[PDB]
Design a protein around this ligand. Structure first.
Ligand code: HEM
Ligand SMILES: C=C1CC[C@H](O)C/C1=C\C=C1/CCC[C@]2(C)[C@@H]([C@H](C)CCCC(C)C)CC[C@@H]12
Ligand SMILES: [Ca+2]
Ligand SMILES: [Ca+2]
Ligand SMILES: [Ca+2]
Length: 402
């Protein structure tokens, strides 16, 4: 299996890496900042230094067009995308689709979700037991973003178990065939759902976008519409959940920071920016492809290569953040690559921040005696090149505050 080269040998994407990748990231940054990883499905490069990562995000030679893997002899007949989502596109199609959906994620709109997000969180908290076993992932961290995305999009509650299962397969280490099947089932479900919405619209986002598509199919094609729905659904199941889990865990393992939050609950938004930096939920950005040779930190990646931008790694770069391994919820936050950078910058950044401060803030306010029910070393993490996320989090809630 893979290990870091140089003075320190740490497992990479196997072994100890899943439990705590942060030492490996640091050894990469120090001694191998532009690393080719010989992974089972083919080699993938990894950039870990903050200055390289942030600039790479605005470097058009690092493209989302997967046809760059192919010799020119082979690109003509090939679709731009495995599924026409904007996160898999370059301009101009990316520009058009982002501009369109961005109109529904205005600052005013996301904030008026706060009362509802708070009811959802409060309802979940009221439903949790005082001392029997609780998996805080499945029972709280997962539930908030999923209910919110279902409500925002207009996804039937009764189908949640079906599409959450498809979503999870797509973001972890599942075989390529399993992912292809999951994507197929998700495409079909959402296509059938949109057909029903035509007949009976609602006021939620998928109906609104179906109407846009119906009125102007060059602005949004039917297939682009399904891919958009799929993207928003997956983002609603697999990101914010791990801000909540990782942020909760950070407070559970850092009594000093938990105390500062208890003493000034208004630190929560600064705290959320710090959780995003300290244990980034999207550990590596989804893959980019070199359209031509690129050079970062003295190392040239040839054209036709797959490249991950190491967000969890860059966000602990001491060249950017002093004392990057210290959790300090009081930092006046700026920069950061946890939501990406440039044209693909997280569409849901305001929504994730809101869900995060509500979920984490109300949790610690309601259950100020919350604690882990296992040792730190017994926590099991998901195997994913995309997310840093707990599989389960055994906790004891303790009594409700008075
Ligand atoms: C803490 C939670 C979240 C994190 C850490 C996160 C992270 C990211 C990152 C790093 C990117 C850029 C990927 C790249 O450039 O390759 C991105 C893009 C994106 N995110 Fe978020 N995300 C979160 C929550 C959400 C939510 C709640 C939504 C729901 C709307 C969402 C929707 C999207 C979409 C649609 C894109 C593609 C944007 C584009 O291509 O123009 N994300 N996200
Ligand atoms: C089966 C296949 C077929 C071959 C593709 O190349 C890989 C694949 C699925 C992976 C995909 C396509 C669907 C959307 C995914 C899962 C993206 C996903 C929505 C990322 C979440 C973005 C997050 C940072 C907000 C990233 C990788 C994408
Ligand atoms: Ca209960
Ligand atoms: Ca209407
Ligand atoms: Ca510096």
């Amino acid at each position: 299996a893979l290990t870091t080269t140089g003075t320190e040998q740490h497992d990479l994407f196997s072994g100890t890496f899943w439990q705590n990748p942060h030492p490996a990231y640091a050894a990469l940054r120090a001694e191998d900042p532009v690393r080719k990883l010989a992974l089972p499905d083919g080699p993938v490069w990894l950039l870990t230094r903050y200055a390289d990562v942030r600039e790479a995000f605005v470097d058009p030679r690092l493209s989302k067009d997967w046809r760059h893997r192919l010799p020119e002899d082979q690109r003509a007949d090939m679709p731009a995308t495995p599924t026409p989502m904007m996160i898999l596109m370059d301009p101009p199609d990316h520009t058009r689709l982002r501009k369109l959906v961005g109109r529904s994620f205005t600052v005013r709109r996301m904030n008026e979700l706060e009362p509802r997000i708070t009811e959802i969180a409060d309802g979940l908290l009221a439903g949790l037991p005082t001392d029997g076993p609780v998996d805080l992932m499945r029972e709280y961290a997962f539930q908030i973003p999923v209910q919110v995305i279902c409500e925002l999009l207009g996804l039937p509650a009764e189908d949640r178990d079906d599409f959450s299962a498809w979503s999870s397969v797509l973001v972890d280490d599942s075989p390529a065939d399993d992912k292809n099947a999951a994507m197929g089932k998700l495409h079909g479900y959402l296509s059938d759902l949109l057909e029903r919405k035509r007949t009976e619209p609602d006021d939620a986002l998928l109906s609104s976008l179906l109407a846009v598509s119906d009125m102007d199919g060059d602005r949004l094609s039917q297939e682009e519409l399904v891919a958009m729905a799929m993207l928003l659904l997956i983002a609603g199941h697999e990101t914010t959940v791990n801000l909540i889990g990782n942020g909760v865990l950070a407070l559970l393992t850092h009594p000093d920071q938990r105390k500062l939050l208890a003493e000034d609950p208004s630190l929560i938004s600064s705290a959320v920016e710090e959780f995003l930096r300290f244990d980034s939920p999207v550990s590596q950005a989804p893959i980019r492809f070199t359209a031509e040779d690129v050079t970062y930190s003295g190392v040239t990646i040839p054209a036709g290569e797959m490249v991950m931008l190491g967000l969890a790694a860059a966000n602990r770069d001491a060249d950017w953040m002093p004392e990057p391994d210290r959790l300090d919820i009081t930092r006046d936050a700026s920069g950061g690559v946890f939501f990406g950078h440039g044209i693909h910058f997280c569409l849901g950044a305001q929504l994730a921040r809101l869900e995060g401060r509500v979920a984490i803030g109300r949790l610690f306010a309601d259950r100020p005696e919350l604690a882990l029910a296992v040792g730190l070393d017994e926590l099991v993490y998901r195997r994913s090149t995309l997310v840093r996320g707990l599989s389960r989090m055994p906790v004891t809630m303790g009594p409700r505050s008075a």
